[PDB]
Design a protein around this ligand. Structure first.
Ligand code: NI
Length: 341
């Protein structure tokens, strides 16, 4: 049954709750972003309102085939009335189309649901700054002090450099980039731009990217693999048995694959910096794992929460075990005591 942490008190509203059938008393199902654990349940046979960003609506319509009439996109940063309740959608700094939602209840309570987010200082000067928020439904994916990671701009810098040097040394080298969902487009789009290439991909992956309101996208992606030296493949295929094979498929056109795997955190974050990363090499192929995150670091989350000073915090990730729940509450208390809310 729909968990309590996906229900907004004093509304007929639920958040990211599509896999429990008809939720009793739900007049509106919000969707924060197009990642499968969050949309699990939607199909062409959904006949209840869905409220989401414009980009998310393009993905619902074109990838899952939901019918134009049941998709209600809202603009960002704009006060909207939904079934007699004022809401606002804010950019979550997660994947394309991902939002946070602000709900202003008739009784005067104000609730922020983060969806999935990477907290940033720029959020402290958004519409959030204009009033008190009482309840915070929080993306706690990396809510532990070991989770440090660098800035996206640092990680993208590294990648642009590795690739440029490798291709300038060997003009017949391929850059491959691993993907499974939307997210992390900047990794591959940045490398393509330094190399003067479009990024080549399958027809389904091209389909996904054409929903995203990226400007000038027609100049940046293609379905013609042969014309292109940055390629996207499945992350299930980013390995030696899979790369070798893929290098065979190109028809004696490249003699070296340099590939990137953009992961959130892995335990080699604790001991090695970004400047001093190495790859795994079997022959002419080399695979690099890069810590590109679209979720808050521990410190990023902590700063945001200490600035917001909510009266109550409900975690939405890592809630399945008592040990995890207990561990997060301890951090929340630490934070509150240090700050004096
Ligand atoms: Ni997500």
């Amino acid at each position: 049954t729909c968990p309590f942490y996906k229900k907004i008190p004093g509304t007929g509203f639920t958040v990211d709750a599509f896999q429990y059938g008809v939720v009793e008393g739900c007049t509106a199902y919000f969707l924060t972003h197009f990642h499968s654990d969050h949309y699990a349940g939607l199909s062409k046979h959904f006949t209840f309102p869905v409220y989401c960003s414009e980009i998310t609506g393009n993905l619902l319509k074109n990838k899952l085939h939901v019918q134009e009439q049941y998709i209600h996109p809202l603009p960002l940063d704009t006060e909207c009335i939904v079934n007699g309740v004022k809401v606002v959608l804010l950019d979550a700094n997660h994947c394309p189309g991902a939002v946070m939602i602000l709900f202003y209840l008739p009784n005067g309570t104000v609730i922020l649901h983060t969806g999935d987010f990477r907290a940033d200082p720029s959020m402290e000067r958004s519409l959030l700054a204009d009033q008190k928020v009482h309840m915070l439904y929080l993306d706690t994916t990396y809510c532990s002090p070991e989770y440090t990671f660098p800035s996206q701009q640092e990680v993208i810098r590294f990648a642009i450099n590795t690739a440029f040097e490798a291709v300038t040394l060997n003009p017949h080298a391929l850059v491959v980039c691993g993907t499974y969902s939307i997210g992390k487009e900047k990794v591959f789009l940045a490398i393509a731009d330094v190399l003067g290439s479009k990024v080549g991909m399958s027809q389904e992956k091209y389909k996904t990217l054409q929903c995203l309101n990226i400007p000038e996208i027609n100049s940046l992606i293609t379905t013609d693999m042969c014309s292109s030296l940055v390629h996207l493949l499945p992350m299930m295929q980013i390995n030696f048995k899979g790369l070798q094979s893929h290098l065979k498929k190109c028809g004696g056109k490249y003699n070296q694959i340099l590939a990137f795997r953009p992961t959130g955190w892995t335990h080699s974050n604790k001991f090695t910096r970004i400047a001093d990363v190495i790859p795994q090499t079997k022959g002419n192929i080399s695979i690099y794992g890069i810590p590109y995150s679209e979720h808050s670091s521990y410190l990023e989350m902590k700063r945001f929460v200490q600035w917001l000073k909510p009266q109550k915090i409900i975690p939405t990730v890592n809630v399945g075990t008592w040990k995890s729940r207990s561990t997060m509450e301890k951090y929340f208390r630490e934070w509150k005591l240090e700050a004096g809310y």
